[PDB]
């Protein structure tokens, strides 16, 4: 069930251009501070820190705004719209600019830009400017970090029994069910002084939760061991939150969580207890099989891609998807996967635009076996 395809082209965003003006990221807010940051409208997507956003610029005012930001601090504020529309939002994310091209072609303004989130904030007020680009109130939300759960009750004598040797090899049977048992027995050895068992303290351990999430990620599809998965729990939590196929309310709830351990526990509960996906209109869909969700990119099963005209669709790549119909021919001028050809995949019952079918173009790949969905009408149940 493996095809000879490199999982780095969709992440590279080569369908925009090739001679991308790479800009080095050297910015950071001072933490816990009042700030004012401009907001680009006409975007409806919750952005998680660390996730890459591909944006298209058409209107002259927003192009002027992004040019001014380029000749300024290269950070705007991506707003996190709630269920109620009309700018009924309370949270957001600061996105840093690291790529910019013009590519006039038709040539009105036309701007190619890619942004990645860096920090979270809670907006206090939403001020609207007469120019058309609004600047909102920004309060930087610090990312809480917690020490080991046993440092409070730890014994001073047996503190030398706290530096474990490196994990032997990786991903081997009886080489993990025993090493993890040893690690649990030796790390939470002071759980006898408290009133709770060792496994309860291991439920709140960062490393154990990351290992469990890694095992689940391998269960979804083959992961290349330490395949760009960060060691720091904050970054791992943000990557997992970016790659989870969940609706808007779940993502904003994940964003509201301020600690790495709570975020990891919530993500693990989400991927362990949610299996059913719905077709919004329709009662259900064949996409209910979560076990066939592939990930043909380094970023994970989901990434953000922009169409020729402004709008941005984040997609989910799955192995199989029934209850769909095909309209149109397999066009290939703007497929988000360079070695693939895209086709319009329409729903079979409610006929709501969700998914794109892909057809064979080369030899060493999967012929007529591909699906790329969207959050347009997919909800988890």
């Amino acid at each position: 069930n493996i095809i000879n395809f490199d999982t780095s082209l969709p992440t590279s965003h080569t369908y925009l251009g090739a001679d991308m003006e790479e800009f080095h990221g050297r910015t950071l807010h001072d933490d816990d501070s009042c700030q004012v940051i401009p907001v680009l409208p006409q975007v409806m997507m919750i952005l998680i820190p660390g996730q890459t956003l591909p944006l298209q610029l058409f209107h002259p005012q927003e192009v002027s705004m992004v040019r001014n930001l380029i000749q300024k601090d290269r950070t705007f504020a991506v707003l996190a719209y709630s269920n109620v529309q009309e700018r009924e939002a309370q949270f957001g994310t600061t996105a840093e600019i690291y790529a910019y091209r013009e590519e006039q072609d038709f040539g009105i303004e036309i701007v190619k830009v890619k942004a990645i989130g860096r920090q979270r904030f809670k907006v206090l007020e939403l001020r609207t400017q007469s120019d058309g680009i609004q600047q909102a109130k920004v309060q930087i939300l610090p990312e809480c970090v917690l020490p080991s759960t046993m440092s409070a009750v730890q014994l001073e004598s047996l503190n030398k029994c706290q530096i474990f040797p490196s994990k032997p090899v990786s991903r081997e049977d009886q080489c993990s069910y025993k090493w993890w048992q040893k690690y649990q027995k030796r790390k939470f050895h002071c759980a006898n002084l408290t009133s709770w068992p060792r496994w309860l303290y291991s439920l709140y351990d960062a490393e154990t939760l990351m290992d469990r999430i890694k095992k689940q990620l391998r269960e979804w599809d083959e992961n290349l061991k330490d395949d760009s998965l960060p060691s720091n729990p904050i970054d791992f939590s943000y990557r997992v939150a970016a790659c989870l196929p969940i609706d808007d309310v779940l993502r904003i709830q994940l964003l509201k969580i301020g600690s790495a351990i709570q975020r990891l526990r919530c993500e693990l509960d989400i991927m362990n207890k949610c299996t059913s996906l719905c077709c919004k209109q329709c009662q259900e869909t064949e996409i209910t099989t979560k076990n066939e969700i592939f990930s043909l990119s380094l970023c994970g099963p989901m990434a953000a891609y922009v169409n020729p005209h402004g709008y941005v669709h984040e997609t989910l790549t799955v192995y199989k998807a029934c209850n769909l119909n095909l309209i149109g021919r397999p066009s290939t001028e703007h497929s988000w996967f360079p070695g693939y050809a895209w086709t319009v995949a329409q729903c079979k019952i409610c006929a709501s635009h969700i998914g794109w079918k892909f057809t064979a173009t080369k030899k060493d790949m999967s012929p007529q076996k591909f699906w790329g969905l969207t959050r347009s009408a997919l909800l988890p149940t």
Binding site: N307, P308, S331, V344, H353
Partner: peptide, 29 residues
């Protein structure tokens, strides 16, 4: 042909106008 009809919200392509209008009203609401 060149078929200038093209859906902007979704990106669906049509050689006529009836299906494009149907898809526009589908996007609406």
């Amino acid at each position: 042909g060149e078929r200038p009809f093209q859906c902007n919200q979704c990106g669906a392509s049509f050689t006529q106008k009836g299906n494009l209008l149907r898809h526009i009203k589908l996007h609406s609401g």
